[PDB]
Symmetry: C2
Subunit: 456 residues, 2 copies
């Protein structure tokens, strides 16, 4: 019952339909990937691969408008955010293209007897399972390091961004990668599970939901494969009493509502000290009234629709649950009276520890503002989570913000900004947010054979 | 159905029996680990931990003979190899106690704007499942890195080394660790699965068989936790035409027959150039006649019994099967006519690619020797294996051995030495031998939060 198709969320219309690859076609795709890997790709020098991967960055920049428009069309992202996605996607590919030689150099080890080094070698085919919320950047985050490492990639995308998926495969074709180096695949869950069992698949990278992560990580475990899991978060956005209030507000608005809050590192739990709570919340109310919500391709649009009826209905559901559980609906909480999946930017307060959404991931334009009485209480609140992806701390006192950062149980903490992407920066969570680090030098370590060669 | 007991492989006598922990006892073990971590262990300084772990190493060395005798008694390791294991176990604990401050110090990141660093923080309770073949070293390998990083440990050892397991628990007690920092546990396979599900267990380290691995890794994946897997090996031991023949025979004998071949990185597949094959085989046949097989508690015994009747019966089975399959029994191939699980050291030749033992892991004192016509044939034969754990290459030409090393598909390659343990040498395999690296700076990084802290 899975359907790969473009259903435009601004217009509610099915634009394009795509067939699943058959068992035979899946076999052909894996056959091709193995062959090119062993016979061609792993044998090319870093410098030859760099040509290709860097050329792909160049193609994305040149054709940024085209690629950003596919993002906006398939899943509704406002064009300025889609164009930003494409720019960072290009940056990520350049980062690995240019840095791979540094990262993939032999690591000689200091030993008092003879010699030892670690040689970095490719593993094989990496199977990547990627989400719809950042359809280019999630692919680049995996494809850039792995192709530079001499791995090949089979990528199964979310069923609602098939054209983005095809555009990324085409990009690599146009950059000069051989057929089989990077391939798209359209599969049901059964076929995906069978692909994980294939002994030629040497690693599984997943970005997505807990549920998806639980099914796939268990499969990878049973097949005794390396895997990485990048899952949801409910990140704390901590605003201390000595925060630059105007700054915290601006970063909170971007953090929660950029991409309509459909971001795993969205500022989902705003944790604001007593002394600046009223002003923060007033700044928040005001800011969401300035959004230009409409057609993601229109000039002045800041926020498009939700990605799908489902994504919208989940957030509206969670909003109404929270209100029935005792929360105050400060703003929003309703679908807009127009065509397409448009939801009002929403603010909730008084969300107690016993409230049904307290521990939920709200993947939509819905702020949750908690009032805390101290620093310690803010840290305690931030940690009262089954998640641990990112986090933000706001304080004019850098050392205080540092101390707070050390005590919040997550994978990443941003100080005086929101959690925001960059190629240089390692990305990943702890607890139910997953394990492993993508991006930075750490990203390229995940799926390689680090071979010890010892002479004595 | 599991029974935790000492059954002395030299006498064949059950010496002591131990009851399973009750679910209530398991509960208290977990509560106490969590409490101790939160309010004590994670909050101690690196230096305070070092004092404890370094004292643990001190006591190991002080009581060398006591601990080594327990290993001998429970699983049959000859005292010189048991003492060596204790010695290296102490050095592992000393290595991480002394080194952790450097290993765990923050990493500055090269960023375009502002600042970023990675800080290294504990995750919580780490569940370790360890084998009988190195009952102390396997525990230190995980307890050392993890305890120093500020994790606490629950350890389930193989059911035939319970006195070793309890002694290692007692060692950290005597060293001043709080109760709950390191704990032994006696569990059946069902309770073990239930412990993996517990949200408080933040990672699973297993060294064991493929089938143990498959079940536990599936469980850890399904519970959304990081697992670490060190499974089978069937390592190549490559002797080229220009090898120092005496040196290669010496290391082959130790590689295959140390701990009676009950070693995941044992030299299981000896691959010898046709020009030196006869003199190599001659040097091997001769060397094995000089073993002193007997009571492992004696300091002049070189080889004790197998660890169990079943480990012994299987190795003898694989031999009979190999000969029925067309192999030549050069030497050994029988149970010794005395009390205990004593097997003769065995050499097999003419094990062809269609012989049923060709891809099998032989976990016993059974050398398999392959003749090859060339360096490339040797590389090809080494790579004709579902495993990729360790490996060795012997050649006076070091450049040539380095090129062969590069070409063998394995996690580690030793030149002119057999695969052998050292604290500063990273350890792991590829293919069906599992994944991840322990020991060195890499071992301490498996179960930590690599937290990004970023000031924009």
């Amino acid at each position: 019952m899975i359907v790969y198709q473009t259903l435009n969320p601004t217009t509610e219309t099915v634009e394009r339909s795509f067939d699943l690859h058959t068992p035979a076609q899946m076999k052909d795709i894996t056959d091709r990937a193995e062959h090119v890997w062993k016979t061609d790709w792993k044998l090319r020098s870093i410098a030859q691969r760099k040509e290709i991967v860097s050329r792909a960055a160049d193609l994305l920049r040149r054709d940024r408008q085209h690629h950003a428009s596919l993002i906006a069309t398939e899943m509704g992202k406002a064009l300025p955010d889609a164009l930003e996605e494409i720019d960072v996607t290009a940056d990520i590919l350049s980062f690995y293209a240019n840095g791979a030689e540094e990262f993939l150099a032999p690591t000689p080890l200091k030993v008092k007897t003879g010699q030892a080094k670690i040689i970095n070698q490719p593993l094989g085919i990496i199977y990547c399972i990627e989400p719809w919320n950042f359809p280019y950047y999630q692919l680049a985050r995996v494809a850039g390091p792995n192709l530079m490492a001499g791995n090949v990639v089979i990528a199964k995308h979310a069923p609602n961004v098939p054209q983005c998926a095809l555009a990324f495969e085409k990009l690599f074709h146009d950059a000069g990668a051989p057929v089989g180096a990077y391939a798209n695949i359209f599969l049901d869950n059964d076929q995906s599970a069978e692909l994980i069992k294939d002994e030629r698949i040497r690693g599984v990278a997943l970005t997505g939901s807990e549920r998806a992560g639980q099914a796939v990580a268990a499969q990878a475990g049973a097949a005794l494969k390396k895997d990485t899991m990048e899952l949801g978060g409910s990140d704390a956005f901590i605003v201390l009493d000595d925060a630059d209030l105007d700054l915290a507000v601006k970063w909170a608005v971007w953090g929660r509502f950029a991409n309509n809050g459909q971001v795993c590192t969205a500022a989902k739990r705003m944790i604001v000290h007593e002394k600046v709570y009223d002003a923060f919340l007033d700044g928040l109310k005001t800011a969401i009234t300035r959004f230009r919500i409409g057609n993601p391709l229109d000039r002045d649009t800041t926020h498009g629709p939700m990605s799908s009826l489902r994504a919208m209905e989940l957030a509206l559901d969670q909003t109404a649950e929270a209100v029935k559980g005792g929360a105050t609906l400060v703003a929003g909480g309703k679908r807009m009276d127009r065509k397409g999946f448009f939801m009002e930017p929403t603010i909730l307060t008084d969300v107690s520890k016993d409230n049904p959404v307290f521990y939920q991931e709200i993947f939509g334009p819905v702020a949750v503002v908690h009032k805390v009485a101290s620093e310690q209480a803010a840290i305690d609140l931030a940690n009262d989570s089954p998640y641990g992806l990112g986090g933000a701390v706001f304080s004019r006192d850098i050392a205080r913000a540092e101390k707070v950062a050390e005590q919040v149980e997550t994978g990443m903490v941003f100080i005086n900004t929101a959690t925001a992407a960059a190629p240089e920066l390692p990305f990943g969570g702890i607890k139910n947010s997953g394990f492993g680090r993508e991006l930075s030098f750490l990203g390229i370590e995940e799926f390689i054979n680090r071979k010890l060669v010892r002479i004595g």
